[PDB]
Amino acid sequence: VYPKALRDEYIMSKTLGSGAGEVKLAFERKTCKKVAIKIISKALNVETEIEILKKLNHPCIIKIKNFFDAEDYYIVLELMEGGELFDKVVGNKRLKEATCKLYFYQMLLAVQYLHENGIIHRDLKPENVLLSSQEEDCLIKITDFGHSKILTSLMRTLCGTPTYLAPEVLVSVGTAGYNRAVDCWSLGVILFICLSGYPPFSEHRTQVSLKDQITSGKYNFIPEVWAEVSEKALDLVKKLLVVDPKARFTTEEALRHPWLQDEDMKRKFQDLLSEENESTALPQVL
Amino acid sequence: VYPKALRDEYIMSKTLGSGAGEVKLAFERKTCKKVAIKIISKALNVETEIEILKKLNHPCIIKIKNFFDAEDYYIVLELMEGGELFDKVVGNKRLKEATCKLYFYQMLLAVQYLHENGIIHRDLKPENVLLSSQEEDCLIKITDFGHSKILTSLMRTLCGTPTYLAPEVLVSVGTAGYNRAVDCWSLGVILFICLSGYPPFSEHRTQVSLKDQITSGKYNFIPEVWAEVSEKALDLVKKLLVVDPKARFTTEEALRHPWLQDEDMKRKFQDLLSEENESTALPQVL
Ligand SMILES: COc1cc2nc(-c3cc(F)ccc3O)nc(N[C@@H]3CNC[C@H]3C(C)(C)O)c2cc1OC
Ligand SMILES: COc1cc2nc(-c3cc(F)ccc3O)nc(N[C@@H]3CNC[C@H]3C(C)(C)O)c2cc1OC
Ligand SMILES: [Mg+2]
Ligand SMILES: [Mg+2]
């Protein structure tokens, strides 16, 4: 059975998805509104995630409504009726380039916001991008902060004299503080897949190991599929899939890239925004 | 003033040392015995250190007796009347090679024990090696676990498919799990200094940066001083001061090194051991 404290406030309903975590539809008794409830079976992963989720406040980042610590973990969140981005791209399905742009722009904003706030997601992928409605033009939100990391001991070590300090520590100074680039790489992969309908790196019809494809950065380019796609878009992908994390495009550089200087897309986003907001906008001093 | 709960059990006495932390002599009321009390001015560093200290049990590792969380932190420990190894090597003072060996052997045991127990010290140096008495032949103990680290997310990342995984993460797999080598490097530096009376790497009478001396591994070799020293000893130093952490000697390899196959030194250690133990040895089934 469900915990009594949960049952007190919510009527549990259908399973929306499972599950490595399960997500169920629920109704908040007080409002009769739909919510999502994530059930994580029984720890530190979760308190981190909760505390991270509580502190974050961005339109393209999932918001937590309630939390229950019981025989299992129960996280109550705003419902994303549109489901996973995964479903929109599975089986070589592919979005209009312009839909890619609208989605990708939001992802970039979300991840930029995470980075400004010292948080690295570390598990960005189509299954962790949720759509807010069943419309093709909607708001997206990043979810699943279980692998996240809060961005040191290196700095403290550097404050003193290295008399006893190991060489590898001094060598790590060259690259320290670029952990956030892993998110930009993932975003690069996600965008590749959204644009093209297929994975840049995979074991499909190739003898190169997955590992070797990735560390060499030799993605699978299929001209016939990409010919349909603009060159501005493909150019952005190529700057995200840079092997050297110090050279890789950051979220800011990506947001300043020509493919995203598109005022039509940006208007549509601001629209969906104010649209979502209307129901909760309190009056204000003019 | 000192906390009432501390004062209740101990009479505070002279400052033994300060302090970046301060250490005072104290007397336990109940036994009238001398203890040391470390005063760390006001956090996570400390709970870690305490919990680490509570769990460890080795003759060459400092033992905690009591702890007080107040306006400041108060750690009560067994008193080391011999003071810091630092004092024995400052101003080009140098120990008989045989004293070096006895000391170094204990350090190796201590650090080997830490590594077996998933703990990396990360701040080994002569000021964190304490002597148990004023005798030249005594027991040594490692102290100061404030920078320690408990030895992953890499493993968890490797369990899945790297479809979205960044190149630098896959590249880090080659060297993952060798963090403990930093302790062996430090031990190498400490042994160099003990044997020779001077630092392997420093800004003294040289134009090479300290950083460059370390990452290149070009220690300062002065034949006149080292001529006095055996070649077995210098050979061990050279295997500890290896730049590549994967090639660097571990504690086990160091303990198996010819310089430490010395049954006379080992007897003297077992003696000091049973000697320390005599006062607390309970009777036992024959
Ligand atoms: C509409 O249909 C669906 C709605 C969904 N809503 C949320 C959802 C998750 C939140 F954290 C917050 C609000 C939400 O709506 N999460 C789903 N699934 C997750 C997302 N990460 C992977 C996956 C897994 C394995 C955990 O089940 C949904 C899957 C659906 O169909 C498969
Ligand atoms: C006998 O004279 C001395 C005894 C000492 N005993 C302990 C001591 C520390 C413990 F953690 C446990 C038992 C002990 O005895 N620690 C000292 N000093 C520390 C060691 N790390 C650096 C240094 C500093 C900066 C913290 O003061 C002593 C310094 C002395 O003279 C300078
Ligand atoms: Mg979540
Ligand atoms: Mg200590």
Q: In summary, what is this structure?
A:
The PDB classes it as transferase. Two copies of one chain form a homodimer. Chain A is built from twelve helices and ten strands.
Report on this model:
Chains A, B: Its EC number is 2.7.11.1. Chains A, B: One of its GO terms (biological process) is cellular response to stress. Chains A, B: GO terms for molecular function: ATP binding; identical protein binding; metal ion binding; protein homodimerization activity; protein kinase binding; protein serine kinase activity; protein serine/threonine kinase activity; ubiquitin protein ligase binding. Two copies of one chain form a homodimer. With 286 residues, chain A is α+β, with helices and mostly antiparallel strands. Chain A has two domains: 1-79, 2-Layer Sandwich (Phosphorylase Kinase, domain 1); 80-286, Transferase(Phosphotransferase), domain 1 (Orthogonal Bundle), CATH 1.10.510. The first copy, chain A, is built from twelve helices and ten strands. Chain A has helices spanning 4-7, 44-55, 86-89, 97-116, 153-158, 167-172, 181-196, 210-216, 223-227, 231-240, 251-255, 263-277; strands at 10-18, 22-28, 33-41, 64-69, 72-78, 83-84, 119-120, 129-131, 140-142, 149-150. A five-stranded antiparallel sheet of chain A has the order 1-2-3-5-4. A three-stranded antiparallel sheet of chain A has the order 6-8-9. In chain A, strands 7-10 form a two-stranded antiparallel ribbon. In chain A, helix 4 runs antiparallel to helix 7, helix 4 packs across helix 12 and helix 7 (181-196) packs antiparallel against helix 10 (231-240). The termini of chain A are far apart. The A-B interface holds A 123-125, 147, 149, 153, 156-157, 161-171, 175, 178, 181-182, 185-186, 189-190, 199, 201-202, 210-211, 214-215, 217, 243, 245 and B 123-125, 147, 149, 153, 156-157, 161-171, 175, 178, 181-182, 185-186, 189-190, 199, 201-202, 210-211, 214-215, 217, 243, 245. One ligand XBJ is lined by residues 16-21, 23, 36, 38, 62, 77-81, 83-84, 127-128, 130, 143-144 of chain A.
